Design a protein around this motif. Structure first.
Motif, PDB file in Angstrom:
ATOM      1  N   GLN A   1       0.841  -1.233   0.000  1.00  0.00           N
ATOM      2  CA  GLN A   1       0.000   0.000   0.000  1.00  0.00           C
ATOM      3  C   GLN A   1       0.858   1.259   0.000  1.00  0.00           C
ATOM      4  O   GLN A   1       2.077   1.196   0.159  1.00  0.00           O
ATOM      5  N   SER A   2       0.218   2.408  -0.192  1.00  0.00           N
ATOM      6  CA  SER A   2       0.894   3.682  -0.013  1.00  0.00           C
ATOM      7  C   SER A   2       1.395   3.725   1.419  1.00  0.00           C
ATOM      8  O   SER A   2       2.458   4.263   1.707  1.00  0.00           O
ATOM      9  N   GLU A   3       0.607   3.139   2.313  1.00  0.00           N
ATOM     10  CA  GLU A   3       0.959   3.042   3.720  1.00  0.00           C
ATOM     11  C   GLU A   3       2.161   2.122   3.896  1.00  0.00           C
ATOM     12  O   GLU A   3       3.049   2.400   4.695  1.00  0.00           O
ATOM     13  N   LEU A   4       2.179   1.025   3.142  1.00  0.00           N
ATOM     14  CA  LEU A   4       3.288   0.078   3.166  1.00  0.00           C
ATOM     15  C   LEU A   4       4.597   0.803   2.868  1.00  0.00           C
ATOM     16  O   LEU A   4       5.585   0.671   3.589  1.00  0.00           O
ATOM     17  N   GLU A   5       4.588   1.576   1.792  1.00  0.00           N
ATOM     18  CA  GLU A   5       5.737   2.378   1.408  1.00  0.00           C
ATOM     19  C   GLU A   5       6.194   3.263   2.557  1.00  0.00           C
ATOM     20  O   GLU A   5       7.339   3.181   2.999  1.00  0.00           O
ATOM     21  N   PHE A   6       5.298   4.118   3.036  1.00  0.00           N
ATOM     22  CA  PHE A   6       5.650   5.090   4.062  1.00  0.00           C
ATOM     23  C   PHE A   6       6.159   4.423   5.336  1.00  0.00           C
ATOM     24  O   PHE A   6       7.009   4.976   6.030  1.00  0.00           O
ATOM     25  N   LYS A   7       5.644   3.235   5.640  1.00  0.00           N
ATOM     26  CA  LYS A   7       6.072   2.521   6.828  1.00  0.00           C
ATOM     27  C   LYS A   7       7.557   2.188   6.744  1.00  0.00           C
ATOM     28  O   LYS A   7       8.250   2.167   7.761  1.00  0.00           O
ATOM     29  N   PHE A   8       8.046   1.922   5.536  1.00  0.00           N
ATOM     30  CA  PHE A   8       9.469   1.665   5.348  1.00  0.00           C
ATOM     31  C   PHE A   8      10.281   2.899   5.739  1.00  0.00           C
ATOM     32  O   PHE A   8      11.330   2.784   6.364  1.00  0.00           O
ATOM     33  N   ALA A   9       9.796   4.079   5.369  1.00  0.00           N
ATOM     34  CA  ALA A   9      10.489   5.318   5.704  1.00  0.00           C
ATOM     35  C   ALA A   9      10.510   5.528   7.224  1.00  0.00           C
ATOM     36  O   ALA A   9      11.444   6.109   7.768  1.00  0.00           O
ATOM     37  N   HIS A  10       9.462   5.057   7.886  1.00  0.00           N
ATOM     38  CA  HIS A  10       9.338   5.140   9.340  1.00  0.00           C
ATOM     39  C   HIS A  10      10.480   4.374   9.990  1.00  0.00           C
ATOM     40  O   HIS A  10      11.186   4.890  10.857  1.00  0.00           O
ATOM     41  N   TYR A  11      10.666   3.139   9.551  1.00  0.00           N
ATOM     42  CA  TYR A  11      11.731   2.292  10.070  1.00  0.00           C
ATOM     43  C   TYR A  11      13.113   2.860   9.772  1.00  0.00           C
ATOM     44  O   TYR A  11      13.986   2.873  10.630  1.00  0.00           O
ATOM     45  N   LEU A  12      13.308   3.337   8.550  1.00  0.00           N
ATOM     46  CA  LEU A  12      14.569   3.969   8.165  1.00  0.00           C
ATOM     47  C   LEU A  12      14.909   5.180   9.025  1.00  0.00           C
ATOM     48  O   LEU A  12      16.008   5.274   9.571  1.00  0.00           O
ATOM     49  N   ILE A  13      13.991   6.134   9.144  1.00  0.00           N
ATOM     50  CA  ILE A  13      14.357   7.385   9.816  1.00  0.00           C
ATOM     51  C   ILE A  13      14.576   7.145  11.305  1.00  0.00           C
ATOM     52  O   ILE A  13      15.317   7.866  11.950  1.00  0.00           O
ATOM     53  N   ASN A  14      13.936   6.125  11.853  1.00  0.00           N
ATOM     54  CA  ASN A  14      14.105   5.834  13.265  1.00  0.00           C
ATOM     55  C   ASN A  14      15.382   5.085  13.544  1.00  0.00           C
ATOM     56  O   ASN A  14      15.833   5.037  14.671  1.00  0.00           O
ATOM     57  N   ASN A  15      15.981   4.520  12.505  1.00  0.00           N
ATOM     58  CA  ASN A  15      17.279   3.897  12.670  1.00  0.00           C
ATOM     59  C   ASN A  15      18.409   4.845  12.320  1.00  0.00           C
ATOM     60  O   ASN A  15      19.569   4.561  12.604  1.00  0.00           O
ATOM     61  N   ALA A  16      18.075   5.985  11.728  1.00  0.00           N
ATOM     62  CA  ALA A  16      19.090   6.983  11.428  1.00  0.00           C
ATOM     63  C   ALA A  16      19.682   7.554  12.716  1.00  0.00           C
ATOM     64  O   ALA A  16      18.972   7.904  13.655  1.00  0.00           O
ATOM     65  N   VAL A  17      20.999   7.655  12.731  1.00  0.00           N
ATOM     66  CA  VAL A  17      21.734   8.236  13.841  1.00  0.00           C
ATOM     67  C   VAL A  17      21.386   9.710  14.113  1.00  0.00           C
ATOM     68  O   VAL A  17      21.440  10.171  15.251  1.00  0.00           O
ATOM     69  N   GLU A  18      21.050  10.464  13.078  1.00  0.00           N
ATOM     70  CA  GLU A  18      20.848  11.895  13.255  1.00  0.00           C
ATOM     71  C   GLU A  18      19.446  12.218  13.770  1.00  0.00           C
ATOM     72  O   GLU A  18      18.464  11.637  13.326  1.00  0.00           O
ATOM     73  N   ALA A  19      19.357  13.160  14.697  1.00  0.00           N
ATOM     74  CA  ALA A  19      18.057  13.622  15.161  1.00  0.00           C
ATOM     75  C   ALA A  19      17.320  14.309  14.018  1.00  0.00           C
ATOM     76  O   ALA A  19      17.817  15.259  13.422  1.00  0.00           O
ATOM     77  N   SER A  20      16.128  13.811  13.722  1.00  0.00           N
ATOM     78  CA  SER A  20      15.298  14.317  12.639  1.00  0.00           C
ATOM     79  C   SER A  20      13.879  14.457  13.156  1.00  0.00           C
ATOM     80  O   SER A  20      13.389  13.576  13.869  1.00  0.00           O
ATOM     81  N   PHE A  21      13.193  15.535  12.789  1.00  0.00           N
ATOM     82  CA  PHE A  21      11.795  15.666  13.201  1.00  0.00           C
ATOM     83  C   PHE A  21      11.032  16.649  12.339  1.00  0.00           C
ATOM     84  O   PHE A  21      11.627  17.412  11.586  1.00  0.00           O
ATOM     85  N   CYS A  22       9.707  16.608  12.441  1.00  0.00           N
ATOM     86  CA  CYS A  22       8.849  17.523  11.694  1.00  0.00           C
ATOM     87  C   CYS A  22       8.090  18.445  12.641  1.00  0.00           C
ATOM     88  O   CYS A  22       7.588  17.997  13.655  1.00  0.00           O
ATOM     89  N   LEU A  23       8.038  19.727  12.293  1.00  0.00           N
ATOM     90  CA  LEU A  23       7.275  20.730  13.018  1.00  0.00           C
ATOM     91  C   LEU A  23       6.122  21.216  12.152  1.00  0.00           C
ATOM     92  O   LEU A  23       6.289  21.379  10.949  1.00  0.00           O
ATOM     93  N   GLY A  24       4.965  21.457  12.767  1.00  0.00           N
ATOM     94  CA  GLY A  24       3.836  22.069  12.088  1.00  0.00           C
ATOM     95  C   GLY A  24       4.002  23.577  11.999  1.00  0.00           C
ATOM     96  O   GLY A  24       5.023  24.126  12.402  1.00  0.00           O
ATOM     97  N   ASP A  25       2.988  24.259  11.487  1.00  0.00           N
ATOM     98  CA  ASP A  25       3.132  25.670  11.161  1.00  0.00           C
ATOM     99  C   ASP A  25       3.307  26.531  12.421  1.00  0.00           C
ATOM    100  O   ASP A  25       3.819  27.646  12.348  1.00  0.00           O
ATOM    101  N   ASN A  26       2.890  26.013  13.574  1.00  0.00           N
ATOM    102  CA  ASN A  26       3.100  26.717  14.842  1.00  0.00           C
ATOM    103  C   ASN A  26       4.246  26.112  15.658  1.00  0.00           C
ATOM    104  O   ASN A  26       4.321  26.300  16.865  1.00  0.00           O
ATOM    105  N   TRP A  27       5.124  25.382  14.979  1.00  0.00           N
ATOM    106  CA  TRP A  27       6.327  24.808  15.579  1.00  0.00           C
ATOM    107  C   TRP A  27       6.028  23.700  16.591  1.00  0.00           C
ATOM    108  O   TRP A  27       6.894  23.326  17.374  1.00  0.00           O
TER     109      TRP A  27
END
Lengths: 111, 111
Positions: A1-27
């Protein structure tokens, strides 16, 4: 699924050593990876009800308006962690729009 | 949604500078980030019908069985890009299971 795809990115970014995150329009945090939880020392569930302003000690110092207009920008600030550590970091922001949501991807290096 | 969450990780990993991707149990690509497309010089749609063995020049040299048992492992190999560049890289693998799928997260540094 489209969800299947995105779930892979979930696993990848959580295994990345670097701190990564998303902020909304009000931070507000919208998504944080494991490295971000480790660095800020807050649990994921804590961070997802928090704002950048609760971590970024120097938040009110930034010319946010100008930041947004830049659309891609890297700069230093100080973060305070849950146990009260104050440390310098380097944030890289990219602003993006998905449907009716503007948000930023942020990568943070502990300096 | 759960999908909403994962979509954030999609945007994050695709903005990450480092080549990151997921392989299925037969080393078929399942998900690749933009940096991986750039490094290998294949389009995303090309990579998603390809195998590690089509890129990793030294694929048959690795003791894959032993690799899997390690479950977390970093090592060097040579990649060949679509335009025929041969270059040394360092791959870091983490094996994961989601439901009935075993797959690996791979981070690749161009050495």
């Amino acid at each position: 699924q489209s969800e299947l795809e995105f779930k892979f990115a979930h696993y990848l970014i959580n295994n990345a050593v670097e701190a990564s995150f998303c902020l909304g329009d009000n931070w507000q945090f919208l998504y944080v990876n494991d490295a971000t939880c480790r660095m800020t020392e807050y649990s994921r569930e804590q961070l997802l009800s928090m704002n950048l302003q609760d971590i970024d000690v120097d938040f009110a110092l930034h010319d946010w308006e100008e930041i947004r207009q830049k659309n891609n920008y890297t700069f230093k600030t100080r973060y305070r962690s849950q146990s009260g550590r104050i440390f310098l970091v380097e944030m890289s922001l990219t602003f993006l729009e998905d449907q009716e949501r503007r948000f930023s991807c942020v990568f943070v290096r502990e300096k």
